[PDB]
Amino acid sequence: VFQQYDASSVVRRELFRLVARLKQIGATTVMTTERIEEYGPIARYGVEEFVSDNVVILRNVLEGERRRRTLEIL
Amino acid sequence: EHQAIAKMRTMIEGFDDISHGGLPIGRSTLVSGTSGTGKTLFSIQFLYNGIIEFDEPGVFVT
Amino acid sequence: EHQAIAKMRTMIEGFDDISHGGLPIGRSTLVSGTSGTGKTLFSIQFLYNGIIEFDEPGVFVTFEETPQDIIKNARSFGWDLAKLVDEGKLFILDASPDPEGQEVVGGFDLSALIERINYAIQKYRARRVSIDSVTSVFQQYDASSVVRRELFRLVARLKQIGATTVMTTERIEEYGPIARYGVEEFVSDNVVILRNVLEGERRRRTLEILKLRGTSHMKGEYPFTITDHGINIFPLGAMRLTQRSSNVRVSSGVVRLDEMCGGGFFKDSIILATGATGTGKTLLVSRFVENACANKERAILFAYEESRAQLLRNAYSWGMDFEEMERQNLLKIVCAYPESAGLEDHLQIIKSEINDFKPARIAIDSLSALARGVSNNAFRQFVIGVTGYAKQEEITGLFTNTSDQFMGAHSIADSHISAITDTIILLQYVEIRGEMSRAINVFKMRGSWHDKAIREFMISDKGPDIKDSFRNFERIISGSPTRITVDEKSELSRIVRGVQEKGPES
Amino acid sequence: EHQAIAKMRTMIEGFDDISHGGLPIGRSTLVSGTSGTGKTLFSIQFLYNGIIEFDEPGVFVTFEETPQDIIKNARSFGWDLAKLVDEGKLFILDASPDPEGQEVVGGFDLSALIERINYAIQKYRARRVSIDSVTSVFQQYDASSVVRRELFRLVARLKQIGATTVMTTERIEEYGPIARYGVEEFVSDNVVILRNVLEGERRRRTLEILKLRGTSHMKGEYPFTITDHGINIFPLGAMRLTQRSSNVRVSSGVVRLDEMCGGGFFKDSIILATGATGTGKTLLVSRFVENACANKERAILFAYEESRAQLLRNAYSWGMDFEEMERQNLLKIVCAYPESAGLEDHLQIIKSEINDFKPARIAIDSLSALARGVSNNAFRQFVIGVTGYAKQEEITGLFTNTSDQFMGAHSIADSHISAITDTIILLQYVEIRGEMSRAINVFKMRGSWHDKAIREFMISDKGPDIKDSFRNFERIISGSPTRITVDEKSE
Ligand SMILES: Nc1ncnc2c1ncn2[C@@H]1O[C@H](COP(=O)(O)OP(=O)(O)OP(=O)(O)O)[C@@H](O)[C@H]1O
Ligand SMILES: Nc1ncnc2c1ncn2[C@@H]1O[C@H](COP(=O)(O)OP(=O)(O)OP(=O)(O)O)[C@@H](O)[C@H]1O
Ligand SMILES: Nc1ncnc2c1ncn2[C@@H]1O[C@H](COP(=O)(O)OP(=O)(O)OP(=O)(O)O)[C@@H](O)[C@H]1O
Ligand SMILES: Nc1ncnc2c1ncn2[C@@H]1O[C@H](COP(=O)(O)OP(=O)(O)OP(=O)(O)O)[C@@H](O)[C@H]1O
Numbered sequence A: 001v002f003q004q005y006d007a008s009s010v011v012r013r014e015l016f017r018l019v020a021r022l023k024q025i026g027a028t029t030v031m032t033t034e035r036i037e038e039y040g041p042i043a044r045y046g047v048e049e050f051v052s053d054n055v056v057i058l059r060n061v062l063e064g065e066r067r068r069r070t071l072e073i074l
Numbered sequence B: 001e002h003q004a005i006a007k008m009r010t011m012i013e014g015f016d017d018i019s020h021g022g023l024p025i026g027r028s029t030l031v032s033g034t035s036g037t038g039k040t041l042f043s044i045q046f047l048y049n050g051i052i053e054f055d056e057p058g059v060f061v062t
Numbered sequence C: 001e002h003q004a005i006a007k008m009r010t011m012i013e014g015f016d017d018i019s020h021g022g023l024p025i026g027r028s029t030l031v032s033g034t035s036g037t038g039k040t041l042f043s044i045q046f047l048y049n050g051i052i053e054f055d056e057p058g059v060f061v062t063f064e065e066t067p068q069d070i071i072k073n074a075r076s077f078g079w080d081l082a083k084l085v086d087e088g089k090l091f092i093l094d095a096s097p098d099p100e101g102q103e104v105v106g107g108f109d110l111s112a113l114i115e116r117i118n119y120a121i122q123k124y125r126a127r128r129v130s131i132d133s134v135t136s137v138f139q140q141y142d143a144s145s146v147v148r149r150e151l152f153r154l155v156a157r158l159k160q161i162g163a164t165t166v167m168t169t170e171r172i173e174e175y176g177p178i179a180r181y182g183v184e185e186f187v188s189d190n191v192v193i194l195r196n197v198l199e200g201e202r203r204r205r206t207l208e209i210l211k212l213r214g215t216s217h218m219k220g221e222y223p224f225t226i227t228d229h230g231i232n233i234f235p236l237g238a239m240r241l242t243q244r245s246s247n248v249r250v251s252s253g254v255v256r257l258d259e260m261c262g263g264g265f266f267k268d269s270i271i272l273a274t275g276a277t278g279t280g281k282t283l284l285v286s287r288f289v290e291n292a293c294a295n296k297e298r299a300i301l302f303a304y305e306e307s308r309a310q311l312l313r314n315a316y317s318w319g320m321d322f323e324e325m326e327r328q329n330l331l332k333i334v335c336a337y338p339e340s341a342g343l344e345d346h347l348q349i350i351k352s353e354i355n356d357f358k359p360a361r362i363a364i365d366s367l368s369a370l371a372r373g374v375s376n377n378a379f380r381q382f383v384i385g386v387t388g389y390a391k392q393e394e395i396t397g398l399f400t401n402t403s404d405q406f407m408g409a410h411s412i413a414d415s416h417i418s419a420i421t422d423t424i425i426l427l428q429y430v431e432i433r434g435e436m437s438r439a440i441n442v443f444k445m446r447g448s449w450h451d452k453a454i455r456e457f458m459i460s461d462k463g464p465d466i467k468d469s470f471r472n473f474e475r476i477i478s479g480s481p482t483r484i485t486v487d488e489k490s491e492l493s494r495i496v497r498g499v500q501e502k503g504p505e506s
Numbered sequence D: 001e002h003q004a005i006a007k008m009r010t011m012i013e014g015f016d017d018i019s020h021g022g023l024p025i026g027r028s029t030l031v032s033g034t035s036g037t038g039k040t041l042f043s044i045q046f047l048y049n050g051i052i053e054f055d056e057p058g059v060f061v062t063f064e065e066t067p068q069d070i071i072k073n074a075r076s077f078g079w080d081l082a083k084l085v086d087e088g089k090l091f092i093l094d095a096s097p098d099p100e101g102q103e104v105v106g107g108f109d110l111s112a113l114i115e116r117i118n119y120a121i122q123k124y125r126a127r128r129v130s131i132d133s134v135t136s137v138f139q140q141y142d143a144s145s146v147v148r149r150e151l152f153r154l155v156a157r158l159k160q161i162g163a164t165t166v167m168t169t170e171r172i173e174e175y176g177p178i179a180r181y182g183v184e185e186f187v188s189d190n191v192v193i194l195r196n197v198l199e200g201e202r203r204r205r206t207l208e209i210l211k212l213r214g215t216s217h218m219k220g221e222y223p224f225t226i227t228d229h230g231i232n233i234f235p236l237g238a239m240r241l242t243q244r245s246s247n248v249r250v251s252s253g254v255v256r257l258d259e260m261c262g263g264g265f266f267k268d269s270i271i272l273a274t275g276a277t278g279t280g281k282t283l284l285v286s287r288f289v290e291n292a293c294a295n296k297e298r299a300i301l302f303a304y305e306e307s308r309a310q311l312l313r314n315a316y317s318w319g320m321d322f323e324e325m326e327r328q329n330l331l332k333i334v335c336a337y338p339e340s341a342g343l344e345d346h347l348q349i350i351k352s353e354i355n356d357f358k359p360a361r362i363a364i365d366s367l368s369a370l371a372r373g374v375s376n377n378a379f380r381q382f383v384i385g386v387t388g389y390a391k392q393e394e395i396t397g398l399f400t401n402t403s404d405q406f407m408g409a410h411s412i413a414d415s416h417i418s419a420i421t422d423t424i425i426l427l428q429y430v431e432i433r434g435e436m437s438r439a440i441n442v443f444k445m446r447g448s449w450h451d452k453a454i455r456e457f458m459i460s461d462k463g464p465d466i467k468d469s470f471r472n473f474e475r476i477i478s479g480s481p482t483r484i485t486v487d488e489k490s491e
């Protein structure tokens, strides 16, 4: 959604907004973000981690031509 | 309430042990990962089991 | 105290030691860390403790988290911040944005905040202030130079107002810049860095005070865990060397052995048991613990290799009923895979269980089980921990270790947990006439004389029977000795012919 | 269509194994890689195979290379696209820029192209489409967010159109992001990464299917080669542990050995001969390969340590005439230094040459010669590939391994062949009275009973002459015996 022409700070707020309004609605939501480095930033803009109350990281680490899927609750 | 945070079971095999109960009720959970990691699936399955295990309707925004 | 700056205590277990007394009053501390490291908690605990322990009202400035949430989450550790906000001891100043807002407002609000805060401090007569996620505010659209100015101004007014402040900050790398804008580091009087290092799929949180303008403090990183009671720090390097030392002996659960040690182990002493897999360290452990219960003394048994069932199936087969030791509330067995956590966690669990049961004897079956994976230093740090806490707790202890190679092991411990140990019990397999016999040896004892022979020992249903030494043998330790004989048939009871009786009579 | 995802086979050697059936139909599959990875080739061979196998027309859209060249290059793999273009089976839709023009024509053309494209799809009744270097299009002056919308629009239209597309992208780092904008990743239903890794001055191209939305596939990287017949992928993990096993026996070339092996070598089995340098391995291989020509059966000899001519001399110097074997088209010698290829290429050459000569036996001289330089794991992965193919192909194979240390060697294979090999023949130097004498031993045989004695053997112009056991010695295996010369019972 923000991948139209935004920057971290603008992203951080938009997310804060969505997260908040959902809290008021009383919904137990699961949001999906994307990454680019298996061990780089937790999310695309380096700001989502700090705005979410909860964070799950799914990894697909390489290493020796094999792939190992893991899951972590940050 | 006036107690800790209550959780909601995901029924995803294992995840509810890892999360000591499941996802925190009334709140969102960010799930990220590179391409091909299981994000969408995690979300589909979370709604699903909610449906098929507690009859908790789910909305899927895509 | 010979420090030049006055400090205030966090009452956070372990922090006040690391900072040689707590946080400097009237000054500000940057607690910066990546995501989920314990920043809010630290700052929340910082105000709570100040209210619960010293009746010091506190102000909590929150930029992202909602006041209801700060209160909802704190119940995780059993804290009723609501009752305090109510008694008017705690005041949460909500400065979070609106779920339906605009854009632009991070400077005059920095002047409106200062004034808001001053108002709250004056109204509630506050002595401690926490500012959670200052970073999030410039996270509207700012650069390093603007941040430095606004942070300074804020911090500088706080100093004037007299307030002792804690400010939270974020960072993306565990080892790179201290805070986001690489400017916060230098504006703060003190800097505490919280990390959550990944490393081999495990997570290790540490706490480090980087700087304290005015006094000294412990340098480097310190392991810690967040539990139901908040942060819990282990200053493993602040552990002094002043353990009491008695000449009190105790039994090992094995009569012959006690003789071999010149009269049993010392109460105040770390015991080391090493031998090849199958030699029988675990038997002496069972025997060691049972004797603490045979004298009506408590004793814990942390198992990291055998299930709670097996430990009992095997224990019983050696006699000794563990079922009863448990009922008489005298013997407590733990059990856990070293993999089920990190040393820090493990060391604490141990510490905990030692308090909730006031043991007089502890046994860790297989240090080398905990040795799995962990680097050697991270392991030694643990061994210093368990061996240390016990020594100063007068708690006698038996530690087990499995040497990676049966027969031929050139060293006691592949880890060198040698100098850390007072008494060493060495078991090994001796190859005599196509068979694997056992051989036990009291390698070393610091205050005692102890027997110098490498005896042979059998394992029956009864337990460990310590026979004699293979005198007429060389290269013993090798694993496969050479039988040389200046005798053997020499006396002892020659008298040939009919010497025995058989099942009927004698 | 209320069923699982259905796949369309590419027919690209190995790819359909990995993707469990092939590319999903009606969906776009991103295939990115760094410069020179075989992206272009993949898409081509994808349409071509489509045509030449299921008569499914193909629409190839290029943005940089030119139609003349595309066809020009394809001839490198022995196929004429021109012909297919003629018969309207393939329509190369040129979309490259000319040496002259204007600018500020951003998303302006992505709309038109989606038209020119749907046209050629309808018009030719195309079922497969390949778009080469979509990337090179936005490489005009765009941002990550602009590229996602232009990409999504295209991918989307194509899915309505119902085509099974393949889009080529480019990367800059072998292991960094997936595509230039680190956005393509998330816009494609499927992502296949082509890599051209450069470790130790050597190059190794691998292919990986990062994801296939809606189905399963093989995970991780998979070695592949680019030959005259196109991309060739070896799914060394796909190979199954379902090899035929008989009780039929064969001769080792050495009568006395055959007895020690309790009746000979099993037709179905892997033979490993290990010993210090000079012990006689190359001899056994020599004798083994000869016995298969005495029975008029074909046998290949892949030598990696000696040359053609020298293999003959020494062979002839032990008897056996290799000169005849070659003429009688019953024996074939290959030879090549391990340094002349990667294991991926060798493993192929081996397989390739076995198909053009249908061997009943095979001898690789010096497994350890192929272990030279290559990592321990990248080697084992070569052993299984060679050991397996021969095993499921009913071929009897002999592999030679020089042990890094003469006398003292505390392990058969330094690299660890154990349990990958059926029969282990072990040669060792033995020092008896200031003299270097040999000794052969049948270490293990999974089927038969074989001899348990360590036998001394000599070498002459007649070949291996297995003598007796050092019965009266100790620490033979060690290599520096000690005769017991026991004074009997001393009366
Ligand atoms: N039936 C299945 N059996 C085994 N693996 C499957 C099956 N279905 C899907 N997969 C695997 O799961 C992956 C699907 O990922 P998914 O669509 O859940 O979300 P994602 O990769 O996190 O995000 P994105 O929407 O970018 O793909 C595939 O890449 C594939 O490897
Ligand atoms: N009762 C508890 N027992 C054990 N761990 C707990 C408990 N409550 C919270 N935690 C842990 O402490 C963490 C809470 O972090 P905290 O709220 O203190 O601030 P933070 O992680 O520093 O910053 P942020 O606001 O970005 O999350 C959780 O990630 C969780 O693992
Ligand atoms: N009932 C029994 N009767 C005779 N011998 C026994 C009996 N139980 C155990 N043993 C002997 O004791 C050994 C068991 O080893 P033990 O449990 O004492 O610990 P360990 O050898 O130090 O360490 P680990 O069990 O992890 O290898 C067996 O190898 C066996 O020879
Ligand atoms: N007959 C052939 N035998 C062996 N290798 C070949 C043959 N033809 C081409 N190649 C190899 O295949 C490669 C061709 O690459 P190709 O044109 O398919 O696209 P690409 O490398 O993916 O992308 P780009 O447009 O950047 O070149 C060459 O780099 C070359 O090494």
Ligand SMILES: Nc1ncnc2c1ncn2[C@@H]1O[C@H](COP(=O)(O)OP(=O)(O)OP(=O)(O)O)[C@@H](O)[C@H]1O
Pocket (backbone or CB within 6 Å): D276, D277, D278, D279, D280, D281, D282, D283, D284, D305, D314, D317, D318, D402, D459, D460, D461
């Ligand atoms: N005509 C011959 N007469 C007697 N002995 C010979 C003759 N030719 C070769 N030999 C012996 O055989 C050995 C040659 O080794 P061979 O060709 O069998 O392979 P290898 O020892 O297994 O491996 P590599 O030669 O690569 O080290 C010589 O060391 C020598 O003792």
Ligand SMILES: [Mg+2]
Pocket (backbone or CB within 6 Å): A032, B039, B040
């Ligand atoms: Mg997804």
Ligand SMILES: [Mg+2]
Pocket (backbone or CB within 6 Å): C282, C305
């Ligand atoms: Mg044991």
Ligand SMILES: [Mg+2]
Pocket (backbone or CB within 6 Å): D039, D040, D132, D133, D168
């Ligand atoms: Mg190309």
Ligand SMILES: [Mg+2]
Pocket (backbone or CB within 6 Å): D281, D282, D305, D365, D366, D400, D402
């Ligand atoms: Mg050779």
